[PDB]
Amino acid sequence: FLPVMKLFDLLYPEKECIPVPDINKPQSTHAFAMTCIWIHLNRKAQNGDSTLQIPIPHSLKLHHEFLQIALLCNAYSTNSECFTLPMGALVETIYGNGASVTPLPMNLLDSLTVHAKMSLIHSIATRVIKLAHTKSSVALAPALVETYSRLLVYMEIESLGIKGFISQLLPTVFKSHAWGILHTLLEMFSHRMHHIQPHYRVQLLSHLHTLAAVAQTNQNQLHLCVESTALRLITALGSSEVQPQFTRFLNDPKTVLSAESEELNRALILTLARATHVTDFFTGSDSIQGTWCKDILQTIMNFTPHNWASHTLSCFPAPLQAFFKQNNVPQESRFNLKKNVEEEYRKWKSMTDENEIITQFSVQGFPPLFLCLLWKMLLETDHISQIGYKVLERIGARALVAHVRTFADFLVYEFSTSAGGQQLNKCIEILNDMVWKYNIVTLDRLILCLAMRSHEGNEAQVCYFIIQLLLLKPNDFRNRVSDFVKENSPEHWLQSDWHTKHMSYHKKYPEKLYFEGLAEQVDPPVPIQSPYLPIYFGNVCLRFLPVFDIVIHRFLELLPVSKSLETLLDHLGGLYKFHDRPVTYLYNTLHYYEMCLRNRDHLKRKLVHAIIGSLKDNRPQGWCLSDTYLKHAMNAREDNPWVPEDSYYCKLIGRLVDTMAGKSPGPFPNCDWRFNEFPNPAAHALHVTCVELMALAVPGKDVGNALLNVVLKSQPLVPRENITAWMNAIGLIITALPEPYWIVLHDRIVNVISSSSLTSETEWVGYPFRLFDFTACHQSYSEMSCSYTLALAHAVWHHSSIGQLSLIPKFLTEALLPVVKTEFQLLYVYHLVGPFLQRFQQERTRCMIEIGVAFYDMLLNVDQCSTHLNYMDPICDFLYHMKYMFTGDSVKEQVEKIICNLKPALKLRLRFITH
């Protein structure tokens, strides 16, 4: 490093004095770097004891010993034996005093902390391992750990650092349950880290699943917190890394991946279904690669999966799970209600002589029985007398799963018998204030069991009513988040007052979940279940998104009252305070919907502004297409904003053609280029294009039409010189949108122009090579429509070369047969199919032969209605290298019976092909 440094100082630091000090309190370390590299040179020379100890620092003498708090904490001299200055420049942990224990949060890293990476690595790590090794008996001292949370480029360049951090956390949970430290750092890590590495995130998922499985968490019944975090780990990874990662954890489910978190397993298989549809991972084949998912099934089948009664089972491309759907034990022959009410009556009548025996007679904890006490109680003001409360809070969740399983059937039966709840308004208010007083349900498992067997067609309406009003009628929490809109949404990335803010928030409305909100004779607080209190609200709003998935994907028969759930999501704007990734949430719920979206179309007629405002819970002024539609939708929003879309789409594609080479530092990349899921602006282009084209129903069919229009009906805004950027842009927007959107391209290429006249007397334009291939339209001349069409084709072919191409072989066998008449049609379809066959050869070899015989079939046609073949030898050698370079001696037998019908010239050409 010394020779390059010397050459640079001779070239870059072309000076001999150090004028213009330029203190620059805000940011100056980008300027004083010469003094830092010189000090590093002096330190290296002193370590080597030669080279005159890197003499003559006079060049920057003023900056040489300029070191003689928050403005100039230039921790540059931290090379060796000077760590005191950087370790004192940043406020360390407090040791004097001891739920506020660590005051004085520091400033956000972007101010000056952007540089301290080579120094602050294990300082906090050593601190936490030291405090965890000995003991943690006093209140947990480390609370400024939020500083360690926001280490973006630091954790980016040191992923092995956090890996070692976790492998050292493993001895911590080995010591004693990692009671305090884990429940302090894991939650904030999950709720603060978003753009984590996908393989690293699935490693984290495996780690958390292993730790939640073993050992038991009877005393740490709040363990479900990490389960909530698990949901955040199964959200943003479905885009691409699912396939490369499937083999990474290939051996884990062979023994353990679905031990007890069966609800979490159903959630993750739902997320996997979301991922597989983007983009069409199973539409190509459904017979041999089925085992690729059977393994997944092979796990959950051991723990009673897919208890769906085929209600929500409507998105799987491979419905092989229908082979195992009868073991769902639905309603237990409908007698489950009678059994549980009989046992509840037995318990209620035996409490007179069993309260001293129920302690020794708690075998299996009676999983679906204790929750039935809510109806028998509250007639004498909560007669529980904490008899079973302590018996409950040892297996609470593990028993409450069955509790809510039977309670769903109970409530649906009761509400179907009453048909209005005039008398059951009692239990209605019981469930309403059940969240007002602290209950152990935490509303974390209700919709899954409710969709298991209660959401059936005979009882879907009562469960929809439940989802609607079980949470909306109680006004203890909706008002709190209603005033919580102007706290984290406007100021989200200014983390400097988070401590006091969250303290005030979670001490004003809530107190603690273990605190028995039920008012029995006694209420011992036991204020020991306070390891860390970072957030109490993110859990419900994080879980609310699969709630939306379930309420929309399966219950779309109800148009009118959907305005009520619109008002509900208006009351739940906090749902969209973490991430805007509705791409999958629109795909998996829109797969077979675009063709039959009429009810959902009228729903979106009012949901447009609703989703707009739900996304508007920010102020970066980044999303303009939505605001552009808004300003274009002043009146009669059902018809107008969809008419001038083409020019509009221009602006749309305009933005995209400015995302790669244009005004790169624009309004799009910001806040904070690394937490809004910004590896590239096209990632943000994805969902905005999605929400734009999901407005009406005539798009999707009209997407490709309007694109081809703006191609040939080139608007004066569309330039003709940098067209290839627009080609890439259309390719991306097509490979991004769901199947009923790009499906039009088939007929756009083969049906519109491939037989415009193009049979015998097309024109003197018949010369195929110079014009049919693209890049011929380099001049304003030589621009044929077929050429631009082939260009758009090749674009969408290369972009969608994942699963969209998988339906292409059959396509050629279905529609391309009775359209091929002439030979330049054959050259055109070759231009269309050929240059992408190696993509199939990479993974989809099993269809190559098809393509092959497809081409061979074309030969037959160009053999029948054909007098002479002028450029036949191109096709001959093309097919020759097709056979020898890609297929080889593979399809000989199938082609033997087809090439025997060729013309004498073709026989004379391919008599070695037949060999």
Binding site: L52, Q53, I54, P55, S59, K61
Partner: protein, 192 residues
């Protein structure tokens, strides 16, 4: 500190002797005036030094001097040690005037004064008996000596070989303290 100047003239007289002269006298010029055996950044603060080379006027068609060492970063001087030229009197006075004008320019614009010292090296006993017909100087070697020592307080010095030239007698006009009495059989002194 780190201030020196070299003036080589004994090309034809100390062609082979120059290697031993460097091995015995040129080493402390870097060992003492720097940290030790020399790639470093080059500045204009004054830590740099100069080195002038002059040839015989007789064995020269038209060229006189080829001085090149403004800064040298204290290592480029070590680079062109062996990059000298070779060519009976020598008439070195025309080359001493070059170092005179060089240190004049130094004192004129390179004044930040580190009292840069200068050393001459010759093997032939030179004398430019014609002190006339020059370009920008019309003085003899004794006049140049008393101007560079008496008028200018620059420390002058001449490191003669084992033999006895006339400059050992010309030293008596060195008014400033030169410390040229004891010979540098031990490590060379900063003031010879």
């Amino acid at each position: 500190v780190a201030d020196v100047v070299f003036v080589i003239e004994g090309t034809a007289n100390l062609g082979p002797y120059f290697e031993e002269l460097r091995k015995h006298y040129l080493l402390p010029a870097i060992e003492y005036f720097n940290g030790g055996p020399p790639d470093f950044g080059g500045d204009y603060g004054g830590t740099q030094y100069s080195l002038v080379v002059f040839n015989t006027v007789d064995c020269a068609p038209e060229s006189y001097v080829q001085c090149h060492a403004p800064t040298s970063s204290a290592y480029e001087f070590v680079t062109w040690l062996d990059g000298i030229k070779f060519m009976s009197c020598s008439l070195i006075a025309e080359g001493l005037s070059t170092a005179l004008q060089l240190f004049d320019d130094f004192k004129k614009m390179r004044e930040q004064q580190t009292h840069r010292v200068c050393l001459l090296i010759c093997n032939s006993p030179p004398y430019l008996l014609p002190a006339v017909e020059s370009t920008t100087y019309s003085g003899c070697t004794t006049e140049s000596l008393v101007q560079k020592i008496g008028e200018r307080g620059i420390h002058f010095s001449i490191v003669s070989p084992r033999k006895l030239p006339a400059l050992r007698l010309l030293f008596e006009k060195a008014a400033p303290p030169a410390l040229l009495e004891p010979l540098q059989q031990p490590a060379d002194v900063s003031q010879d």
